[PDB]
Design a protein around this ligand. Sequence first.
Ligand SMILES: Cc1cc2nc3c(=O)[nH]c(=O)nc-3n(C[C@H](O)[C@H](O)[C@H](O)COP(=O)(O)OP(=O)(O)OC[C@H]3O[C@@H](n4cnc5c(N)ncnc54)[C@H](O)[C@@H]3O)c2cc1C
Ligand SMILES: C[C@@H](OP(=O)(O)O)[C@H](NC(=O)CCCCCCS)C(=O)O
Ligand code: SF4
Ligand code: SF4
Ligand code: SF4
Ligand code: SF4
Ligand code: SF4
Ligand code: SF4
Ligand code: SF4
Ligand code: SF4
Ligand code: SF4
Ligand code: SF4
Ligand code: SF4
Ligand SMILES: O=S(=O)(O)CCS
Ligand code: FES
Ligand SMILES: [Fe+3]
Lengths: 137, 291, 652, 94, 183, 92
Amino acid sequence: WEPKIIGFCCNWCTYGGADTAGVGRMQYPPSIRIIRVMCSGRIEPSLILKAFKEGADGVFVGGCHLGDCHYDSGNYKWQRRVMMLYELLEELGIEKERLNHEWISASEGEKFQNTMKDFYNKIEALGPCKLKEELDK
Amino acid sequence: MKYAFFLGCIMPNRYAGVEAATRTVMEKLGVELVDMTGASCCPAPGVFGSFDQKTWLTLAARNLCIAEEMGVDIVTVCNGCYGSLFEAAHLLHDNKEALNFVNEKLDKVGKEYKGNVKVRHFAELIYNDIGVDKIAEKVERPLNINVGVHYGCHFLKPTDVKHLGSAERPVMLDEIVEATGAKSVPYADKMMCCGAGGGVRARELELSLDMTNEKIENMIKAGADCTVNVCPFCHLQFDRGQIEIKEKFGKEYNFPVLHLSQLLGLAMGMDPKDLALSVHQISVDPLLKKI
Amino acid sequence: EEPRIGVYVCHCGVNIGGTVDCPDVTEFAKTLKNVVVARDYKYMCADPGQEMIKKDIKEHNLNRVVVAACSPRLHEPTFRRCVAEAGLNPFLFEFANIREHCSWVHMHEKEKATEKAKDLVRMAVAKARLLEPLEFIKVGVTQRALVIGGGVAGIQTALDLGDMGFETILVEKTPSVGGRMAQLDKTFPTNDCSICILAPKMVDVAKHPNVKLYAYSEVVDVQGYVGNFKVKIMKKARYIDETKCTGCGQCSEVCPIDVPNEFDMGIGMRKAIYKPFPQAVPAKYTIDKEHCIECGLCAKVCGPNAIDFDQEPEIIEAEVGTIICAIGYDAFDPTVREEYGYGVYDNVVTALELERMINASGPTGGKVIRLSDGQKPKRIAFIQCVGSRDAKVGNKYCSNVCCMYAMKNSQLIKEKSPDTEIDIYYMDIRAFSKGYEEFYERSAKQYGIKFMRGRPSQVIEDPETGNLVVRAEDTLLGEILEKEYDLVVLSVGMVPTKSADEVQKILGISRTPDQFFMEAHPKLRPVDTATDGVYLAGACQGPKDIPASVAQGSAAASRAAIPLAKGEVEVEPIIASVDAEICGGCGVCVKQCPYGAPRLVEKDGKVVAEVISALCKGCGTCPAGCPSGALEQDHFKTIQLFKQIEGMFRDT
Amino acid sequence: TFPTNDCSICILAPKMVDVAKHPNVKLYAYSEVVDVQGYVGNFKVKIMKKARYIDETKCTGCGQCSEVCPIDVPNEFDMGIGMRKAIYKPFPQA
Amino acid sequence: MIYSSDLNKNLASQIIEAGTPIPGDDVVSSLKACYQCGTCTGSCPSGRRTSYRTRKVIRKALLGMDDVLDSDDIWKCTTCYTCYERCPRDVKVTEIIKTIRNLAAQKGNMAKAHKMTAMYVLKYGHAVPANKNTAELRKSIGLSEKAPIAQFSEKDLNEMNTLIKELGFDELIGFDWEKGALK
Amino acid sequence: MIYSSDLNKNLASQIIEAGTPIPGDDVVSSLKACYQCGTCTGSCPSGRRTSYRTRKVIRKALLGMDDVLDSDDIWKCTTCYTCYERCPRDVK
Ligand SMILES: Cc1cc2nc3c(=O)[nH]c(=O)nc-3n(C[C@H](O)[C@H](O)[C@H](O)COP(=O)(O)OP(=O)(O)OC[C@H]3O[C@@H](n4cnc5c(N)ncnc54)[C@H](O)[C@@H]3O)c2cc1C
Ligand SMILES: C[C@@H](OP(=O)(O)O)[C@H](NC(=O)CCCCCCS)C(=O)O
Ligand code: SF4
Ligand code: SF4
Ligand code: SF4
Ligand code: SF4
Ligand code: SF4
Ligand code: SF4
Ligand code: SF4
Ligand code: SF4
Ligand code: SF4
Ligand code: SF4
Ligand code: SF4
Ligand SMILES: O=S(=O)(O)CCS
Ligand code: FES
Ligand SMILES: [Fe+3]
């Protein structure tokens, strides 16, 4: 079994950080699949919960550093949403640690690499999230 | 503050006066000092890390298991023990393959390291947690002497894990010994090795003594009346080395050598004899004359 | 119509095919719903690849195209133009990133990388099915340019733009234009007087009919998009009347505050009222209100009474079409490398302090003197790679110019004092451009300059004399050197300038791992940014010498002139819009936008929200926060992202 | 190509495509300037457009012809390593 | 003269694997980042009075010269960590020298005085065991005449002897258990 | 160890002056063009069987180590002229 991880990255800095890790051949585990959005402010609770419903073992979200948002303040809305979302996932019996949000600039290819490594190992240690098979009855 | 007191080897078995000095010095600063029953060689990281890296960590993790099962953090008086145990705790917390290897070994002795032990050096513990003001308030007899501070290598370094500030230009021990009323004198190549670490004293004795003699020269040439250390190996190397230096090189300095706990001891109104200063192979009496 | 998708999986030579099983990905793509054509080719962006796509679009009547290849940040425009040439709307195209995001990061797990590429194709096909035809938005381009930074690179861009007949604004933060080139004494490899060749350019830009120079000014706000920028320039108060003041400087004497003269890197002190350097353009004096104690003694000596503390900063609002960032760089602070002793020993100096010491207009009158006793140093050691090629300080890059400037000033010292011994402690001599290797040979054969291959381990000061011992292994001998010097010069590297953070947030541009500003691509677009209508020039883009900055200055002028000359660009219609039949006028969305695009209006005798398409940049925050779902940003609808999340686990 | 390790085709080939169909660029391939007279703003240049012996307007570039050619030629684009036909196109993305 | 036949292509990879998982794969593989600047050599206090050149040790490893494992000079490092502090390429030199010393010890190039020190910890639990001068001095000072250390607790000495075999450390030093002496 | 006091800063200039006018100022001052590539040492037949490293002799001169003049190694050069032929810096 390998973790199924879903990623949401903003077009401007974090997507540039993932590109930088690829340009530098910075290896990291192949669990995640990344979905592009223009801004992390585009990310909302519905997208995260939708991913867990479909079978996500982990969900990663990356945006610009706070203050460096290409659209000025999109990340601040997202940061408020994700702090609520952490504890909502606990009330649903989903481990807080299965959701991970990070601030990654286009220069931070190395940081993105280790974030991908640390998040993989965390989810791999947690084992699969069993929601999709509980709902399938 | 309650701390498991790791003794090591040199201080308990050869320079016990430092053990007596430390127990009282920290007694008054307000720390209950617990014994770690059955603690062994830490083991010395320079010698044993060089012999077998696996053996160093396994035996080191074991001494840490003693303290966590006591539910208590370690404080040590020696850079050698501080480095070995601090780096062991850090490596086991940070590298899970190293931790698996160790517990598969500690399993055969009914032990398992789980990561709760913090390793602390008594000088750093004095600076960060107690406060250097509480060192000055307690000076019964001020020591207005010039002191050649020897930090030792395994105190500050590696800085990437110790997080004790600069290893090139530290102030931590200088402010401590100046709180006793003494003056920390600058000298050439202050942060250099004493020569004894890494197994060199045992294998290449005069190689180590060439480096200690370099240090001593720079200290006296800067007007130091004595040297102060935070490590028994530095102590023995500076102390017993001077006997040896005289016998083999012909250099005689009569340069007094003190561990910091002993020097703080005098600040607290301690008796020369409970410091076992007579046990020093170079007489400190020229220092006691000036104080 | 039902989607008919063509999927194209590139090998990128071997960059993808070497790790991802591209044939096996194309076979998998054919099993997906609505995929009617699937091919893998070595270079999708090459002519045979683009002709392949377009031939399939026409012969198979494709209404969607998926390319699984590199990042869209590289070639999304390329393929949007490709599919639009075959008739397909540019926004029925979806990009799957299987190189940067897969093949290049999973080289040791080929089986999983191949499986991953299949998932990334399926997630792309999923979103592709719900993509809709969008119309690019044509906007007029304002026939004016803005250049931020008045160094040799920004000056070059303004002169080029001005000479083309484009109105151009040049904003310089300090009192004078000129940049660090104005601080240099000479310039390798010709040893031209730096100020003497640059000053005619500074003169030209101040006199240019199409260039408005705002010295002692800063850009404080940028709004809008390419061709439609609205910018605010704060003309800071000198507290001196430009019209009523001579520039003679008879008010400094009546000043009790001495201030670090930053133009001389702090070696000499300047007064509260000052002129940066004699050749300054504009040649008008300034008062630093930060260190001003407002005791008014200067005002009593001042004749014209040009001194007015009431003077207020004036904000300029100006519409420009393109912006060029050229704010330069700063010298690395070598205090962190404590073993070298900077800030601790008197006779350790940076190379940029040296430039000011050697320069005739400098504080020392062009005389190299030790800062401990003022004597001339007879033995001088240069230490290379200080703050560069050094993971311990976080700067793992090469600063590009330090090898050459260290040999340069070694030549200039030898010329003023032949008997000076000069040693250069280096790792690689990087004399890489035309005349540089010759300059390197000349330094050794003609000027007798010595080269020690060995990065110094530490500098030790003799407290008696103030002299310095440098300790290094002569790696070309296998022996440890311990030579004594009277002055040690640290060949410090280049770091971004202090205000690069402020500028970065205002323009909305990224940074490379070296902390300098990020070009769109090092070879495709070396002076563009991923922010349309914003360009780079000079050392703010990365360490480089004067000819390189000038070339980028001109390059950025050409690139910035394209939209101005076209007079019309196209922006992305990925904007938010409100569905009036679902909007109940909650009011949540109006405060979310930093540009105030969503607004509360009354429609059909009731309150709904409505977004001004012109003020929306397409971040997608307000649609994500909308409770009713009335808000949606095209090309990023919740239903499209929903299908993309399903695509990871299953087809649809 | 260093230091990104893109393929050269990644960066160059789209530029080669754009240049060939640009409305303001007349491309004279297999051509050489043979004379330039005059001065700034007033140059009169002569271009020798060499003969390919294939009507380019009618040419498809499929490459069927190269297969039949009965002779071999040292291919200069491959620096004398690979051998081409006398009927040729320099490299597959030309 | 040096030929290909005199060089070992796997020397660097051998050193790396010996350092895995202790002190770490990434720690010891840093040797491959060294660019021969010599800052380590200039910092070495041992190098200022011997033929020991820290940089040359790293160099010979990368080049494949096995005679490093037999050299006396790798044993003059005091592990001061100064090079470790100053290396501009993040080479964990001090850990690399210790790993190289492990392979040197497994090659039989271990000093007798070093073999002794290892025996003292194996036998008494301590590299520096207690004397009777230790008793009578600690007697004069007011301390427990014997320290609460493993030396006077063979429960812990049981534990250490246990681990040493499991690690093969006694056969590395060539120690025999019943005669209680080295071979 | 090598300190300033054991070095002679002017050794290279002595060698140059000793070579004027024979075999020539420009001939011997070519010593200052050496950039320590080691092509000479690889070509030297004497170096293939002794500790003699041609490049080190040039190096020791530029740095100022007078013990070159007392060394046996300068006398192991057979004057074959091979390094002269191949030196990329025209060092005579
Ligand atoms: C010691 C040393 C020696 C050198 N010697 C040479 C040499 O001999 N030859 C050579 O070719 N190169 C040399 N260089 C490199 C050379 O200095 C640069 O190539 C050159 O300065 C680049 O010019 P620039 O305009 O890109 O940046 P800069 O010269 O730094 O100019 C940037 C300008 O923008 C202004 N600015 C900064 N921030 C803002 C803001 N927020 N708003 C508005 N304006 C702003 C600055 O005041 C400055 O005027 C040397 C560098 C150093 C450090
Ligand atoms: C053995 C010991 O001699 P003594 O038995 O104490 O006389 C001395 N040092 C050592 O080797 C002790 C082992 C290393 C301990 C240092 C750890 S800080 C030596 O051999 O010169
Ligand atoms: S660039 Fe994008 S497309 Fe052109 S080749 Fe390299 S990958 Fe395939
Ligand atoms: S003094 Fe009055 S006038 Fe002479 S300069 Fe300063 S301001 Fe302009
Ligand atoms: S006022 Fe501020 S500035 Fe004018 S003088 Fe007194 S101080 Fe110097
Ligand atoms: S340039 Fe010469 S010096 Fe400046 S960095 Fe690259 S190398 Fe070190
Ligand atoms: S939020 Fe959704 S609903 Fe409430 S207003 Fe803005 S749009 Fe109409
Ligand atoms: S989307 Fe981002 S930008 Fe377009 S409006 Fe809602 S917020 Fe302002
Ligand atoms: S054959 Fe050779 S030439 Fe005739 S068309 Fe096909 S390609 Fe152009
Ligand atoms: S320093 Fe780091 S790099 Fe320079 S040599 Fe010693 S090791 Fe190789
Ligand atoms: S560590 Fe071993 S090597 Fe690195 S310096 Fe201290 S001693 Fe010289
Ligand atoms: S060759 Fe010419 S340059 Fe290369 S070393 Fe021998 S001499 Fe110096
Ligand atoms: S010449 Fe003297 S030196 Fe140059 S190679 Fe022949 S021998 Fe070696
Ligand atoms: O000798 S060791 O390097 O192992 C410890 C130094 S205190
Ligand atoms: S654009 Fe990346 S967080 Fe808003
Ligand atoms: Fe002039």
